[PDB]
């Protein structure tokens, strides 16, 4: 409709929010989808997608995505005709719900798609779609909001993680130890065949002295300072290759 806020559609209460604009990130996307049989069809979906807004819910073990792009019926029917394990039903008002074992897809109007995937406790498509009329009001950090505004402007990938601890122990790999850590923000922008990133992490009760700061600053090859209880990492880089390898683990 007139004013669809994509974050209002994915829903409030998520453990992780994602903003992923396609422009400027094609080569990263390419790296991620070199490892799938459906790479020809995904590529075509990417060519028709401007940005993806995502939310992960740990409690119901689900991901909800809102895709802003161009998805005319001829195109989606073409992709659908070429897919294994997908079924479709037309609702009361002519909208097609595509259903898979763990995935639901609808195209409620030609400029957007709503995707829900995960466990059997994932949200009903119909409930997500009601948020087109009555959107949720999630609370997002200022730079996350900035990247999401005026779709087409930003080429920065943005992540907001409610619990930074969980995310540190999975990535760095000590999936047993517990860290009392607050919210994490992460922003990634392409530059050559690498990504510039900025990270901020609320420390809570956890204390990080100069010895620890210095070592992380070497493990990451980036500038570190602590503003109160907020750890900030600026001017760091990661290879598009390295970055591609990390996302594929999920």
Binding residues for a copy of itself (CB under 8 A): 172, 174, 211-212, 214-216, 218-219
Question: What whole-number distance in Å separates Cα of residue 229 and Cα of residue 180?
Answer: 12
Residue 211 Cβ vs a copy of itself, minimum distance, rounded to whole Å: 6
Residue 180 Cβ vs a copy of itself, minimum distance, rounded to whole Å: 14
Residue 219 Cβ vs a copy of itself, minimum distance, rounded to whole Å: 5
Nearer to a copy of itself, 40 or 172 (CB): 172
Nearer to a copy of itself, 124 or 218 (CB): 218
Nearer to a copy of itself, 142 or 211 (CB): 211
Question: Residue 209 to residues 138, 181, 220, 222: CA-CA distances in angstroms?
Answer: 34, 15, 17, 17
Residue 173 Cβ vs a copy of itself, minimum distance, rounded to whole Å: 10
Residue 236 Cβ vs a copy of itself, minimum distance, rounded to whole Å: 15
Nearer to a copy of itself, 40 or 212 (CB): 212
* Triad 185, 174, 216: Cα angle to 5°: 55
Nearer to a copy of itself, 29 or 216 (CB): 216
Nearer to a copy of itself, 7 or 222 (CB): 222
Question: What whole-number distance in Å separates Cα of residue 113 and Cα of residue 49?
Answer: 10
Residue 218 Cβ vs a copy of itself, minimum distance, rounded to whole Å: 5
The two tokens of residue 239 are 């290879």
Nearer to a copy of itself, 94 or 211 (CB): 211
Paired with 194 in beta bridges are: 191, 239
Alpha carbon 200 to chain centroid, angstroms: 17
242 three-state secondary structure: helix
Question: What whole-number distance in Å separates Cα of residue 88 and Cα of residue 86?
Answer: 7
Residue 139: exposure state from Cβ atoms within 10 A (0-12, 13-18, ≥19) = exposed
Residue 37, φ and ψ in degrees, nearest 5: -70, -35
Q: How many CB atoms lie within 10 A of CB 191?
A: 11
Question: What whole-number distance in Å separates Cα of residue 135 and Cα of residue 128?
Answer: 9
Residue 207 Cβ vs a copy of itself, minimum distance, rounded to whole Å: 11
């Amino acid at each position: 409709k007139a004013s669809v806020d994509p974050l209002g559609v994915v829903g409030s209460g998520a453990d992780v929010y994602l903003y992923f604009p396609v422009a400027g990130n094609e080569n990263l996307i390419s790296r991620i989808i070199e490892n799938h049989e459906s790479k020809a069809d995904i590529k075509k979906i990417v060519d028709r997608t401007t940005a993806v807004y995502g939310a992960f819910f740990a409690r119901s073990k689900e991901f909800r995505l809102f895709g802003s792009g161009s998805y005319p019926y001829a195109f989606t029917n073409l992709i659908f005709s070429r897919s294994d394990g997908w079924a479709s039903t037309k609702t009361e008002h002519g909208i097609t719900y595509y259903e898979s074992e763990h995935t639901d897809v609808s195209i409620p109007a030609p400029h957007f798609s709503c995707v829900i995937f995960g466990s059997s406790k994932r949200e009903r498509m119909s409930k997500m779609l009601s948020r087109l009329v009555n959107p949720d009001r999630p609370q997002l950090p200022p730079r996350f909001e900035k990247e999401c505004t005026s779709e087409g402007t930003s080429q920065t990938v943005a992540l907001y993680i409610k619990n930074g601890g969980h995310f540190i122990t999975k990535l760095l790999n000590f999936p047993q130890l517990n860290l009392p850590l607050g919210a994490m923000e992460l922003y990634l922008t392409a530059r050559r065949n690498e990504y510039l990133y900025t990270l901020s992490l609320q420390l809570g009760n956890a204390k990080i002295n100069f010895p620890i700061q210095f070592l992380i600053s070497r493990v990451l090859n980036a500038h570190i300072h602590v503003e109160g209880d907020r750890l900030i990492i600026e001017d760091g880089t990661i290879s598009a290759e390295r970055l591609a390898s990390v996302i594929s683990s999920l």
